Amino acid sequence: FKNQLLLTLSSPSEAIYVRTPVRSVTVPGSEGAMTMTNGHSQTVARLKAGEIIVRKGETGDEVERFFLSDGFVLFKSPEDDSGCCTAEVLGVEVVPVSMLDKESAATALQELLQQGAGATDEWTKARTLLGQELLSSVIRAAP
């Protein structure tokens, strides 16, 4: 086909891309953010939160932002006959940034801190901390 990057960005409830040809795609790995392009090595990574940023070949400058909660990324080298290199970004809940809110975000953060103030269980403390992480990411990412 072409020497592009075939992205598929998918959640269970909606597949946003299937074989979209793009140039570069940034993704928030569990260690830190990183950007996949054509030629990138075969790799697997776990994601933590934040704003995937897609950049089509037709766009170049224009972008598309999507918020991801958690999931995985799988970059597969290009088949010899396809001429094109593929990537799969799986997310348990993938929203756009247009559909996000900072007020309900901060309210949920407040209620999470309220629930976790009675820190007794390990899972409750951990859930409070991880909710703090994700909600801070939502706040920093929303417009």
């Binding site: 409830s13 809940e93 809110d101 999470l112 951990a126 991880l130 909710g131 939502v138």
Partner: protein, 65 residues
């Protein structure tokens, strides 16, 4: 943080997607919590002779019990 707390990655992912769904805008948030309600009925057996039956409508109590 979860193999120490005795928690699964699926449980953590679900319980965090719940909070994200709570941080949505109302028109899409309605459809989200709609398409992500819960209704299950677990039924535990031991060589026949049911030990217990219990219903679940919440993710946290479903993963806990």
């Amino acid at each position: 943080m979860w193999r120490s707390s005795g928690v699964s990655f699926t449980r953590y992912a679900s319980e965090m997607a719940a909070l994200l769904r709570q941080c949505l805008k109302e028109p899409y948030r309605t459809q989200a919590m709609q398409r992500n309600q819960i209704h299950l009925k677990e039924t535990v057996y031991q060589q026949g002779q049911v030990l217990t039956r219990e219903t679940f409508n919440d993710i946290k109590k479903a993963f806990e019990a």
